[PDB]
């Protein structure tokens, strides 16, 4: 609008006032994404970007927010002539979606750091003409809503955002960039990415947001970071309270990562009477299993990270093994690098450091250690098996020798008497899906792991050194 009913809670003088605004907007047929993103961006600006003069909460005066809102709607409605894009029957056209995307795109500063913090909201778009990659996609959806295009919705994978629109909301359109140095595909469908079974498009099991989930997205996009060492407690509390509002309304039901984020927030500062982080992590996994064919990686990464931070090696290993069991049915494609980096860091930094400490604790007499649990060895094996199976049929390889030394080291953290207890069964018991781990089976139980043979098997390296 802004409509009169949207204005009554102003001025927003507190976190709870912002929550009241979100509660009011979420009670409407269409929560106003532009209003809410401007409010979030405003409060984030004065709580994380510039806290000079902050004495409690940056009062969001209606005059300020309405002026920002007016700047956005004036820019969108001036630059997008809906008459050039007749809507068949409550359905938007690819050309109209492309136009809105172009309008947002062409509004941005010609040169800026695209990965900066706090450039995710419409406040950044208006006051700084800067948006990050997913912020452009959100702004396109917000602009489309402002234009009355009820069918245009945010589509979210775990690393990318686009829009769905059109008849039955069945059309997809790229509206922003992805990554760095990647070829722009704005205006195109995501069908090639779905067909190639990349993680980036989740084999089609990506989120198709309704407006409430788009509110959830902007809430998940709140960035409390003031600097590398300091988060705004105010923004953490705001994001946490808004996520609980969304949770209670059912709007995180189909948003696995939001449930992980909420679990993380609860671990940092538990809300009395709320589910434990673990319950929330498993709700995120349940959400992925229920709505997304169990084809999401981050629900298990969230869970694994929790167990890792609590130094719970067994459950961390189980969760990472579960992460790999999801990734195994993907093809590793160009633009999947973010999840490659995650698997790489887990295999080659996080697990080694966990097992290193576990080894020291085992030497100090720990009981029930993951290193003496063959099920934990099996988890480690299943983690690598899923990564190896992921690699099979992929257009780009996953493993290389830079993984092999960490594999040998991690395997060696388990004594042979533990490793021998895992029975690798063909099609603690473990079935390998990957041919690489199948060929590695006999090597996994030697008292002294054959490092060179493991390396050859993991990398499919043909030969050893000539001389």
């Amino acid at each position: 609008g802004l409509k009169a009913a949207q204005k009554t809670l102003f001025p927003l003088r507190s976190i709870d006032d912002v929550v009241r605004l979100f509660a009011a907007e979420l009670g409407r047929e269409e929560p106003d994404l532009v209003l809410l993103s401007l409010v979030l961006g405003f409060v984030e600006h004065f709580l994380a970007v510039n806290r000079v003069g902050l004495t409690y909460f940056p009062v969001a005066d209606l005059s300020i927010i309405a002026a920002l809102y007016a700047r956005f709607t004036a820019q969108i409605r001036g630059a997008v002539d809906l008459s050039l894009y007749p809507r068949e029957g409550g359905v938007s056209s690819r050309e109209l979606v492309k136009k809105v995307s172009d309008v947002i795109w062409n509004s941005l500063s010609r040169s800026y750091f695209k990965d900066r913090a706090h450039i995710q909201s419409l406040f950044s778009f208006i006051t700084g003409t800067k948006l990050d990659s997913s912020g452009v996609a959100f702004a396109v959806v917000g602009a489309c809503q402002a234009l009355g295009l009820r069918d245009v919705h945010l589509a979210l994978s775990e690393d990318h955002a686009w829009v769905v629109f059109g008849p039955n909301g069945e059309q997809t359109a790229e509206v922003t960039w992805h990554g760095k140095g990647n070829e722009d595909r704005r205006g195109q469908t995501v069908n090639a990415g779905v067909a190639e079974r990349s993680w980036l498009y989740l084999k089609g099991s990506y989120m198709r947001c309704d407006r409430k989930m788009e509110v959830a997205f902007m809430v998940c996009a709140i960035n409390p970071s003031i600097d590398l060492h300091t988060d705004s407690l105010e923004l953490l509390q705001l994001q946490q309270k808004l996520l609980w509002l969304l949770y209670d309304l059912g709007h995180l039901e189909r948003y696995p990562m939001a449930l992980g984020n909420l679990a993380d927030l609860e671990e940092l500062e538990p809300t009395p009477g709320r589910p434990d982080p673990l319950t929330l992590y498993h709700k995120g996994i349940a959400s992925a299993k229920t709505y997304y064919r169990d084809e999401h990686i981050y629900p298990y990464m969230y869970l694994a990270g929790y167990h890792c931070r609590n130094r719970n090696v067994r459950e961390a290993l189980q969760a990472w093994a579960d992460t790999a069991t999801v990734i195994q049915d993907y093809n590793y494609c160009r633009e999947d690098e973010e999840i490659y980096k995650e698997f790489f860091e887990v295999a080659n930094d996080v697990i080694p450091n966990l097992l290193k400490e576990a080894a020291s604790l085992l030497e100090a007499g720990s009981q029930g250690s993951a290193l003496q649990d063959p099920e934990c060895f099996a988890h480690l094996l299943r983690f690598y098996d899923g990564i190896c199976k992921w690699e099979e049929g992929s257009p780009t390889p996953v493993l290389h020798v830079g993984w092999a030394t960490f594999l040998v080291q991690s395997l060696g953290r388990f004594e042979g008497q533990v490793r021998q207890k895992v029975r690798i069964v063909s099609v603690p018991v473990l079935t390998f899906q990957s041919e690489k781990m199948k060929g590695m089976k006999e090597l996994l139980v030697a008292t002294k792991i054959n490092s060179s043979a493991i390396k050859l098997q993991l990398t499919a390296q043909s030969q050893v050194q000539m001389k």
Partner: peptide, 12 residues
């Protein structure tokens, strides 16, 4: 911290 897609698990 390195830019994460929103709702990505935390960096470190």
């Amino acid at each position: 911290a390195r830019w994460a897609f929103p709702x990505a698990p935390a960096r470190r």
